[PDB]
Amino acid sequence: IVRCDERGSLGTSGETCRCKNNVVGRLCNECSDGSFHLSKQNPDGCLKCFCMGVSRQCSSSSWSRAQVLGASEQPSQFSLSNAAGTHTTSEGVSSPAPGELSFSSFHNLLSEPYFWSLPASFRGDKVTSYGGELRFTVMQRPRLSSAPLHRQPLVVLQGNNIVLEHHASRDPSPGQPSNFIVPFQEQAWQRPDGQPATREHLLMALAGIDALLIQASYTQQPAESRLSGISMDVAVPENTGQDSAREVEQCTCPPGYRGPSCQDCDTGYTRVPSGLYLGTCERCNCHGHSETCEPETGACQSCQHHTEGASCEQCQPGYYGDAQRGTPQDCQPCPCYGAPAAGQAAHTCFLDTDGHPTCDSCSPGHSGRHCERCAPGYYGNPSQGQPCHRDG
Template sequence: MYCPTTMFCPTTMFYPPPIFCPTTMFCPTTMFCPTTMFCPTTMFCPTTMFCPSTMFCPTGRAVLDRLSSTTLSEVAAASGGSSGASGLLPAPLDVAAFCAVSANATCGLLGPEEFCREMPGKRGVVCDVCEGPESSSSRQHPAAMAADGDPATWWQSPVLTEGGDQHVVLVATLPGKMELLHVTIKSGPSPRPLAWSLEVSSTENGDDWRMVRAFGDRDHCRKLWDLRPERRRRKVRAVKRTSRAEKPSCSTQFTSPRPLENGEMHVSIADGVPARRVRVSFRAAHPSTRHQYYTVRDLTLAARCICHGHADHCSVDHKGAKCSCIHGTCGAHCQRCCGAGAWRAHRACVERADECSCGERGACSYDDTGAILCVNCTENRAGPLCDRCLIGYYNVLADDPCAPCDCDPEGSDGSCKWDRKHHQVQCACSAGFTGALCDRCEGENTVFPNCLVEVTTAACKCDTRGIVDSSRACDDVCECKVNVIGERCDTCAPGYFGLSSELHDGCRPCYCSHVASHCIANPEAGDDVSMPLGDAWLITDSGAADTVEPSEDEHGKPFLISYEVEGWEYFYFTSAAYSGERTAAYGGRLAARVTWAIARGDSGGSATVMPDYVLLANDGSRLSYGNTSYESPGLTELIAPLEEGGWYSGSELVSRGQLLDVLSNLKAIMIRAHFHYDQDEVRLDSIELKGSPSNIREICTCPVGYVGAQCTACSWTHVRLLRAPGSAPAFECVPCACNMHAGCEAVDGPCGPCQHNTTGPHCERCLPGHYGNPVQGGCKPCACPLYESSNNFSPNCALASAEGDEFVCTQCPDGYTGDRCEL
């Protein structure tokens, strides 16, 4: 390769393979190039690249090498921003080798599993066997092999079912919270996936997953994520569209089934994203004449430590990531001042001459104007000066600690204040309740805690809510409704709740996700939910097989000209606005306002007859509500109570349990958009969910491993495994192999941080200085002879016998003896 004295970089530099250059590239006067140039298949460059005096083509990690010398000032300058001279960024590193990697499904766990694949450049297939962890052969493919750095190993999923659920996730837990910049995934002996997404969570327990980017063909982009594939959008005349800048994109890149193995996928994150966990969510595999499965041979995670501009270097290992802090800052992320200075990102800690007014209520910091700002408020305080109590707390004097309100949850929202006149706490009571703690009813003839009028009188024996004929409350023998028991018909039968005169059978059956049968009525009312409009909605046919993008009016309301979907019975469709676990919606009602019009002069057509609403579940279940016609165009209100009695599966009414099964795994909502065969246009004006009244939902007594009011989630020590579509229950909470002391991402995955003073791969041992049996319970600290460190002379102790809780200290120092080093 010939290198001229001055090198002008074109927009695209064609090296074999091509390197995509930035918009502006500053090159050195002299550029030294080796005889042989080894470049990555695709190089992702920043907007502005600053070249060193001597530039050598890298051997495969140009992005990491280039970013390693970038400072915050350069990044800000390249993006048009600015920062102080003291702002620093540490070098990015490939941290995959320091990550704990797990998967929710791995081949071989249920026994030896055969898989077959097409061979590149050859006819026919090659078959092999994947074995489980009990095998000592090289046929194991656990999740850890995705990041072990060995090109001869890989992770592999089980063989997938054609047309079935193909969702498998691979999760990497970073050594600490870091800024993720670039991800490279190299497949093993399988094609790259047809559809997948990259997601990050900033917390270790993964409760805030956020999708960074999705990849798939046109159909999967829309059906899986309700995203438009990256393409040139058609222009709609006289229509103002809303911005999509905050939505993740769905790219059709990497969707080819070629190469058949070792294909690479690259994701660059221009501004970086804070991440503690990184999840690769595989959603669909390419069709195959043989077997479908996913593999990952190599995972590269380019990330750098978050040091808030106070370090240009950090150390990373399996135990964590720690910045080498300067500017008088301390902490793993340089997140505080070592002394009493005021901490600010990108600025050195400086001692302030003015006195901090936060006192013991919080720590002093300063905003951008230099004004005092109290942070890390204590004693349940809040506010910029820690000068008020959190909601649900109160104090008598301004400097007093904030104490909990202790209001009755039935009669108040939990907030309170100190009544100076009566010298007592006064809670904010709901309508119908009274008293300082809202623990009494306001009306004379009402009964706490529901503050309803008593349904029976002293003269009559039977509870009118539970008897078949309410006019016979004074009979000697009470005739109970089907789901009611008791001499007075005043108790729900086991497995039922919510005694009510409005219910034909007296009580509702407990749902509890089909895993429990004991429940009580939930006194909490459901919340109202106003769903967004705009690009959250598409137009789909009655089978939800195809979609069309509606236009938006000047108010962001989606509308459609009917000729665009001629021949369809069409609906508004959304999975983005409302989906997932939605059992809390039961008992509420859907309320949509739709405006439609008939073309002028057209009068030969008739009204359509079709459902007002359709609910789709992820397992393929489909429920519909209403089957009516509307004759008059204009504003039409569509109301659907989310209770059994009006929802159908095919031609059959569904039960409460069937409706809740769909709500627990909701994929999408469809709203009627086609009202007349001469219809010209339609517009969705609003859609909201009205919350349910109290006592219509239940609180279940869940079995071990299940949590939530209706047992819809797994506890932190259990992992969720889906069962076959149509099963009841639809999922199972399986305990992690961590002795109930830690959580896990998958049954075969590593345990998270061990709790209860335990340690070990499965939290099976006590920490040093503790004793007990972690397999049966937690570990307690040694007392040799006392707990205080000044009088605790043995670093270790152990149970005295397999039974009982007695222990002996095992390392008494010279001069001390006895079971507790007490002599």
């Protein structure tokens, strides 16, 4: 009899092994191409590499698990929001202990569900939260007359133009605390219309969290809402002593990408809004004046050769030429004489329609394209060195 792998088999015709979708091998104990992390709990056996669509080669991160705690954040940093985040406030939010939050001024709010809006340390790039959990305790009380709400999200995750929701199997009873454990796995999230989350979509939201919202109202007329014991799983490169983040994909990215899922443009590359996921990463457009730029916006950085602008497209003041040509000598020093008018920093001049510079920040009582003569009712010779003083 063959002993089929317990993590990877669906069953056994005693002499053959039947593998889950993403599993391969005689004993169904290997992940298929584009898969990683064999586990018994995964019905498909192995997760699929996603890698923001730019790679199919990945394996389990060996980052360690750690938690972001609510206690880590100033209570000032918590607030209430509607789902749309068009109505927010922290007026009334108080904290009786660190990481514990309390609210009881619903009279000041409109008649819609409000959420606790977790602060920044819970947002941004949380791809490594995949395969972990958001944990928390809530307690709620309605005003005397108030039915629960119907089908309301316990948690809303918003990132990268995706909204996913997690709905609780039970509502918290009035005036007693409930522990929730929300897994970062597709099975636990749906779109607002109630379509299942995909792995790809959960990852894209997690990679760019803009809001992470916990239900605070629960009923139509809430009296009181309290939040505590907030714990969000992540993964860090440092060893922490906790298990490694095996569900977190470590992709081999192509040139121009980094992050464990190729979610970031690498040094010398910037985001291009393309199609399907986050877009693609292309090389900086810096007119040859730079190799580094803002990964998301595109703005060039540390423009060389006396250039400036978002593409290093212009010569810095005190220089003239065509920075767009792309050579180191593109921009030349303005050949002006004397002091700049209204006592300026440097001298401005521009490349005139004749291929030669003209100075346009000449001092008063200067003249000519290089500020080299003196205006009428003035005297002196700047070329030789003297300034220009007025007549009498």
